[PDB]
Design a protein around this ligand. Structure first.
Ligand SMILES: [Zn+2]
Ligand SMILES: [Zn+2]
Lengths: 576, 394
DNA sequence: ACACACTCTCCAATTCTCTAA
DNA sequence: TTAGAGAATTGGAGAGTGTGTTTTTTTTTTTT
């Protein structure tokens, strides 16, 4: 084996002499600068990069990659020995734990207690990432790189590093460094005075003196497309500690550098985990309307309705007499009609959204669920956005009541263990439904065709029947497009809706009077020709205010009401 | 000599600290007449409550130094403030009789930390947080002073106990026989404790995530002041404890469990008779009282009168109370009207005829999720006895 | 590997006895 | 009269030994 003293001096030489042609080629010696910041307590963790080491000594890099734990300890001791040379300044007292250390120094006048920094390796660029299936037992103890998806994360917990006790009789203190996942505490004083006199003094543990570190537990899983044919995906446990905590999130793609090790017992076969050293994450109105689903011919005003669904209205909030701004709409489709393309286009387009289907498949439902913590739910995962329901007509009573509760309160409840937990569901709803049998029949009402109950079905601001039928030129055009596809700016739109949705336009009393006259005349025609109700008025308000938000204007105007009126009026024509 | 005492691990003098708190009591007048807390001291002397609240903002505005020491070392500072208050309370009014020493409860007016941002740096500091209550335990008794009696000769002795450890006698001092002293459980002295579970409130969550939770322990006076579902602001000491690997073995795990040690928490006439008499003597009072119901509804006056008459009712054989039915299309304002009148009467109840309803009309028997013993669950109709019960989708 | 219950041993503290200060 | 040395009996400090330790298929009554 190597002489680790010689290796220590080599590591010191690297820290003392290396410059990356750094600070725009001024050769300011990056690690020397870092040691100054560390000495003056400006910074806690230090990521040493193995590509830098490779410039001087590739054999050292190879030495590190196998049995990495030795070199972790070695580099940490080297940094502690060199730190006073880069100090020039006295640091202000800022921590109770360090106030105890200061008192200890004042009274005196192990190193692990004082070592307030963290040292980690950034993997060499030679090492391509392995999949969770290729980290076999020949890699125990070696530095590895892995790629996958996060599934679960715990809260941050305090992990014990060194314990500090005080003695009732002799007034001394004792220390106990911790390394294994468990330990056994001290009881009676080992100091010479107490021992020689057998005076029996007891030891009291001090949470004001002992040292703790931030600790968090995580799980990571294989990508589905990487799994070989006819197999179930696997998972690996990752332990996060120190300044690496709170980076990762559930459902997020990550690449992790770490050491692969076996778990300590308390048989010859043992479980393993990955010790993390670094975590890396992987006019305007007509133009925007024409930008929605250009693959689909016609349906000009339906695209504008979906645009305003994405833009939204305003929450009025007059002292609890609430009117909400979220638009909600529903599409009734004939069998096999083009609605799937439009639906998926809005799903793809929207910056925050989710999709589900009403049949109640083997996966998790519309609401959250429990496993052995709470998780999931399409209604939950779309929150500051829009959620889309497919084949709505096949929903169950549980689904209908869940949608009803979301429409009223925009929140849900699921019982973890009998406790009445409750959970945010702030999103807008988009529904897709199909008639009970065959094509829609114009001789019968929409309730008779689609057969959802009228109470919740009438919640939607707009209802559209997507009916279509053969024609030679249109079918030929469609076939030409599909066969052509088989043979051979969203950023601006997102920024536009980002800036324009800052507006919350009001209405003046003149517009309220105008709306009053228009609404009563509309209801007169509605009963003379009924479906009209207060919901209709609030829908008009929502769509007109949404259009006012689409403009860069601080108030609604006559044209906004007129546009909303023709949109709600003409929607009936789709049913006939 | 008390002046020699200094808190361990630091350099703060105890006696000086006590003096500074007494100066605060003797000086702090309300900035918006004797000092503000001296008014409460005069009042509590006759009212007979055992506790004194103090707002931290008054301490800070009076002195930055004392405030910093309080937040840093609550375990040693708070008992000192207790002693200060009791000295003033008995130096004044010496003939007053009180069963217990006064407790002081410092409290901070508003939340300082999110319960997602508590860190190992906070341990044993005084913090304040806010959330929604989920569950409350049964009351737990807790030992304070053990009573030992000799089996051989009936001699007795008492043992003050040390952070959970009892110093059991080895030999009876009267009769010199070893292993003859027995603990008498029901002669020992006990205290009350309760365990409370709390959750972050839905407003301050990151989007689409599930909520976090914490465990609170409340002692003596505070032991029964909250119920599930409501919302509170709490001030306490953030503690941390090791846990054992198994009930037999003495090894402990290397990752600790933390909880809040509660100190204070806050929830978020002849003149009236004469006004009522004059108002009742005014003409058209029946119309006026009916008109007052549901201002969102502009025309249904006789329906409002019927509801008013139901609220007033008859008087006591025959059923003296009144029953009313509302019929017609769905989507009409009747459900809003039910919810309005439900909120007007103390013994009120509200539920739906649908099976999805939150509480049933029928009484039933079930196993307790905590103890798994049987409990009898009476329905909404029983709970609303001598009250109004609103039913929807009837 | 880490805790009760039981059995057993050797070292030296307490008292009797004879002696000197 | 007061105190120390040599011999005999006994307590207990200490060591050694033995033992324990949610998630799927099928039936039956009564609700529909
Ligand atoms: Zn000691
Ligand atoms: Zn006795």
């Amino acid at each position: 084996l190597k002489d680790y003293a010689l290796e220590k001096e080599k590591v010191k030489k690297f820290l003392q002499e290396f410059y990356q042609d750094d600070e725009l080629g001024k050769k300011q010696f990056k690690y020397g600068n870092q040691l100054v910041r560390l000495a003056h307590r400006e910074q806690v963790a230090l990521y040493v990069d193995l590509d830098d080491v490779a410039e001087d000594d590739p054999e050292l890099v190879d030495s590190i990659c196998e049995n990495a734990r030795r070199y972790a300890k070695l580099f940490a001791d080297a940094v502690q020995e060199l730190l006073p040379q880069y100090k020039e300044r006295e640091v202000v007292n800022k921590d109770v734990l360090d106030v105890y250390i200061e008192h200890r120094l004042m009274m005196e006048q192990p190193a692990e207690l004082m070592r307030r920094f963290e040292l980690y390796f950034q993997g060499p660029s030679s090492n391509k990432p392995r999949v969770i299936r290729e980290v076999r037992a020949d890699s125990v103890g070696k530095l590895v790189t892995v790629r996958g998806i996060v599934t679960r994360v715990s809260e941050v917990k305090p992990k014990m590093v060194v314990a500090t006790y005080t003695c009732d009789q002799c007034g001394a203190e004792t220390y106990q460094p911790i390394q294994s996942p468990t330990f056994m505490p001290l009881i009676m004083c080992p100091s010479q005075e107490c021992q020689t006199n057998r005076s029996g003094g007891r030891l009291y543990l001090q949470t004001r003196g002992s040292r703790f570190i931030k600790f968090q537990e995580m799980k990571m899983q294989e990508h589905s497309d990487q799994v070989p044919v006819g197999n179930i995906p696997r998972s690996i446990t990752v332990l996060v500690e120190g300044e690496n905590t709170r980076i990762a999130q559930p459902g997020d793609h990550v690449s992790v550098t770490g050491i692969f090790l076996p778990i300590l017992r308390t048989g010859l076969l043992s479980e393993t985990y990955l010790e993390a050293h670094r975590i890396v994450k992987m006019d305007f109105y007509e133009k925007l309307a024409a930008s929605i689903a250009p693959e689909i011919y016609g349906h000009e005003d339906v695209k504008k309705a979906l645009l305003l669904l994405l833009v939204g209205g305003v929450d009025q909030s007059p002292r609890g007499m609430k009117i909400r701004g979220n638009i909600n709409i529903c599409l009734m489709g004939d069998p096999g009609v083009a609605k799937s393309q439009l639906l998926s286009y809005i799903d793809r387009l929207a910056p925050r959204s989710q999709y589900t289907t009403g049949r109640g498949s083997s996966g998790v439902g519309l609401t959250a669920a429990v496993l052995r913590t709470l998780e999931g739910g399409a209604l939950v995962l779309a929150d500051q956005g829009v959620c889309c329901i497919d084949e709505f007509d096949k929903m169950a009573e549980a689904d209908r009541t869940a949608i009803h509760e979301v429409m009223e309160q925009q929140t849900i409840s699921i019982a973890k263990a009998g406790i009445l937990t409750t959970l945010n569901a702030r999103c807008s709803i988009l529904a897709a439904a199909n008639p009970a049998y065959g094509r829609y029949n114009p001789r019968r009402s929409l309730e008779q065709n689609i057969q959802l109950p009228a109470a919740l079905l009438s919640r939607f601001d707009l209802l559209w029947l997507i009916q279509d039928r053969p024609d030679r030129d249109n079918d030929l055009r469609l076939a030409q497009h599909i066969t052509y596809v088989h043979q051979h700016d969203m950023k601006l739109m997102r920024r536009y809706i980002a800036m324009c949705r800052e507006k919350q336009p009001m209405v003046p009393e003149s517009l309220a009077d105008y709306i009053t006259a228009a609404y009563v005349e509309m209801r007169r025609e509605a009963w003379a020709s009924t479906y009209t109700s207060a919901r209709t008025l609030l829908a008009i308000l929502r769509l007109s205010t949404a259009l006012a938000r689409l403009r860069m204007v601080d108030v609604v105007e006559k044209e906004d009401v007129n546009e909303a009126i023709r949109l709600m009026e003409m929607s009936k024509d789709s049913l006939l | 000599l008390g002046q020699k005492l200094v808190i361990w691990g630091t350099d703060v003098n105890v006696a000086a600290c006590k003096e500074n708190f007494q100066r605060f009591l003797q000086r702090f007048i309300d900035p918006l007449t004797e000092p503000l807390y001296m008014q409460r001291l005069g009042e509590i002397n006759v009212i007979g409550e055992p506790f004194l609240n103090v707002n931290c903002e008054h301490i800070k505005s009076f002195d930055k130094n004392l405030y910093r020491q309080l937040i840093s070392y609550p375990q040693e500072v708070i008992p000192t403030f207790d002693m200060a208050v009791n000295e003033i309370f008995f130096d004044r009014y010496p003939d007053s009789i009180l069963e217990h020493q006064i407790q002081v409860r410092p409290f901070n007016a508003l939340k300082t930390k999110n319960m997602r941002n508590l860190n190992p740096e906070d341990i044993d500091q005084l913090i304040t947080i806010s959330g929604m209550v989920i569950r409350t335990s049964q009351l737990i008794p807790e030992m304070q002073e053990a009573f030992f009696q000799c089996q051989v000769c009936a001699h007795t002795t008492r043992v003050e106990m040390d952070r959970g450890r009892i110093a059991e006698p080895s030999v009876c001092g009267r009769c010199h026989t070893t292993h003859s002293m027995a603990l008498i459980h029901n002669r020992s002295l006990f205290s009350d404790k309760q365990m409370i579970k709390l959750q972050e409130s839905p407003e301050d969550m990151p989007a689409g995530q599930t909520p976090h939770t914490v465990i609170l322990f409340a002692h003596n006076d505070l032991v029964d002041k909250v119920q599930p579902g409501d919302r509170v602001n709490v001030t306490g000491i953030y503690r941390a404890v090791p846990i054992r690997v198994n009930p037999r073995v003495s090894n402990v795990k290397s990752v600790y469990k933390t909880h809040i040690d509660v100190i204070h928490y806050r929830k978020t006439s002849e003149k009236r008779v004469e006004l009522l008499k004059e108002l009742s003597r005014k003409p058209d009072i029946y119309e006026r009282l009916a008109s007052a119901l549901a201002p969102s509804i502009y025309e249904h006056e006789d329906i409002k009168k019927g509801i008013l008459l139901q609220l007033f009712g008859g008087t006591r054989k025959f059923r003296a109370e009144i029953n009313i039915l509302l019929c017609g299309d769905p989507g009409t304002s009747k459900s809003q009207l039910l919810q309005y009148v439900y909120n007007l009467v103390p013994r009120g109840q509200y539920t739906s005829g649908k099976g999805s309803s939150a509480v049933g009309l029928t009484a039933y028997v079930m196993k307790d999720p905590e103890t798994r013993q049987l409990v009898l669950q009476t329905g909404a109709l029983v709970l609303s006895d001598n009250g109004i019960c609103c039913i929807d989708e009837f």
